[PDB]
Amino acid sequence: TTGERLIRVLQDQLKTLQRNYGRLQQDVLQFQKNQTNLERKFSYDLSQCINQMKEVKEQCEERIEE
Amino acid sequence: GERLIRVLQDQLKTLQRNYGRLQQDVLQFQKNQTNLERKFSYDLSQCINQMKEVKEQCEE
Amino acid sequence: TTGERLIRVLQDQLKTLQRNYGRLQQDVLQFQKNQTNLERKFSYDLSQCINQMKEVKEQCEER
Amino acid sequence: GERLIRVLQDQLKTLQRNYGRLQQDVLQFQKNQTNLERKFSYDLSQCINQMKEVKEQCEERIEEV
């Protein structure tokens, strides 16, 4: 003992370390995998806005009674 | 005897501090990206709904 | 004029769209800023990892 | 008359290309984000992998004395 006691605190610090880091990994995995559906949603909405803009232009240009 | 263990104990407390900085950098980035996305998705929706309104103004 | 009332509505709406574009441009600029910032932080954290690794290495196996 | 209509047409068309560039800048930013995430995962893992080599090294050495 006395040196076994210190070694036990060291084992404790290491497994607290390891468990925290493992928890962070799956938090990063959670976030990043969930990011994909959002990136696709923005991409879609930006294209649609660009397409509606194109329909707007054609129709307003048609609105010529001048 | 050999207090390499007390050195290691010191290094693990430093490594725990540095993990703490890494965890807060990652989590802060994630929190800001989610808040900015709420705004980004609001502004995209606004382009869409505005463009719907212009179409019907030009269709009457 | 029916046409001159629509012209005023179209010019008001063009201003709102230009505003919308600038908010979208500022949104994308902020993604760029948050990202490069994280790249700078992560660069520092990685260096702290490698260099404390290197030194625990020499601390052990050489007493 | 169509002077104001001229410039409404001009401003709209310049806006349409600015949204176009906007769209290309989002696709590119998204993609670089993905690549930075992946290189950063790889580089931290290489550091952790060397960390673990030093653990085994330093646990072999604690009880050698």
CSV table of C-alpha atoms in Angstrom, one decimal, chain A residues 3 6-7 9-10 13-14 16-17 20-21 24 27-28 31 35 38 41-42 45-46 48-49 52-53 55-56 59-60 63, chain B residues 5-6 8-9 12-13 15-16 19 22-23 26 29-30 33 37 40-41 44-45 47-48 51-52 54-55 57-60:
chain,number,residue,atom,x,y,z
A,3,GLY,CA,2.2,3.3,-3.4
A,6,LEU,CA,-1.5,6.6,-5.3
A,7,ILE,CA,-1.7,4.2,-8.2
A,9,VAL,CA,-6.0,7.6,-7.7
A,10,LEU,CA,-4.1,7.6,-11.0
A,13,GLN,CA,-8.1,10.1,-13.0
A,14,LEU,CA,-7.5,8.1,-16.1
A,16,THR,CA,-12.6,9.7,-15.6
A,17,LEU,CA,-10.6,11.1,-18.5
A,20,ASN,CA,-15.4,12.1,-20.5
A,21,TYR,CA,-13.7,11.8,-23.8
A,24,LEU,CA,-17.6,13.9,-26.1
A,27,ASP,CA,-21.8,14.1,-28.7
A,28,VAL,CA,-19.8,15.0,-31.8
A,31,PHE,CA,-24.3,16.7,-33.8
A,35,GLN,CA,-26.1,18.2,-39.5
A,38,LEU,CA,-30.2,20.5,-42.1
A,41,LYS,CA,-32.8,21.6,-46.1
A,42,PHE,CA,-30.9,24.8,-46.6
A,45,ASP,CA,-34.7,26.2,-49.8
A,46,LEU,CA,-32.0,28.3,-51.5
A,48,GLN,CA,-36.4,27.1,-54.5
A,49,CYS,CA,-35.9,30.7,-53.6
A,52,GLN,CA,-39.3,31.3,-57.4
A,53,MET,CA,-37.2,34.4,-58.2
A,55,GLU,CA,-40.8,32.7,-62.0
A,56,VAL,CA,-41.3,36.1,-60.5
A,59,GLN,CA,-44.4,36.9,-64.8
A,60,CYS,CA,-43.7,40.5,-63.8
A,63,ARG,CA,-47.2,42.3,-66.7
B,5,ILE,CA,3.2,8.2,-10.0
B,6,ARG,CA,3.1,11.7,-8.4
B,8,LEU,CA,1.9,11.2,-13.7
B,9,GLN,CA,-0.9,12.4,-11.3
B,12,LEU,CA,-3.2,13.8,-15.8
B,13,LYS,CA,-4.6,16.8,-14.1
B,15,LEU,CA,-4.5,16.6,-19.5
B,16,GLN,CA,-7.9,16.9,-17.8
B,19,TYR,CA,-9.7,18.2,-22.4
B,22,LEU,CA,-11.3,21.1,-26.1
B,23,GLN,CA,-14.8,20.1,-24.9
B,26,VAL,CA,-16.4,22.0,-29.6
B,29,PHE,CA,-18.9,25.9,-31.8
B,30,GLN,CA,-22.0,23.6,-31.9
B,33,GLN,CA,-23.8,27.0,-35.4
B,37,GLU,CA,-28.8,28.1,-38.5
B,40,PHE,CA,-30.2,31.3,-41.8
B,41,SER,CA,-33.3,29.2,-42.1
B,44,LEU,CA,-34.3,31.6,-46.6
B,45,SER,CA,-37.9,31.1,-45.7
B,47,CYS,CA,-37.0,34.9,-49.6
B,48,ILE,CA,-39.4,32.1,-50.4
B,51,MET,CA,-41.3,35.6,-53.8
B,52,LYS,CA,-44.7,34.0,-53.4
B,54,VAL,CA,-44.6,39.1,-55.7
B,55,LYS,CA,-46.0,36.4,-58.0
B,57,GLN,CA,-49.1,40.9,-57.1
B,58,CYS,CA,-47.9,40.4,-60.6
B,59,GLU,CA,-50.8,38.0,-61.3
B,60,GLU,CA,-53.6,40.6,-60.7
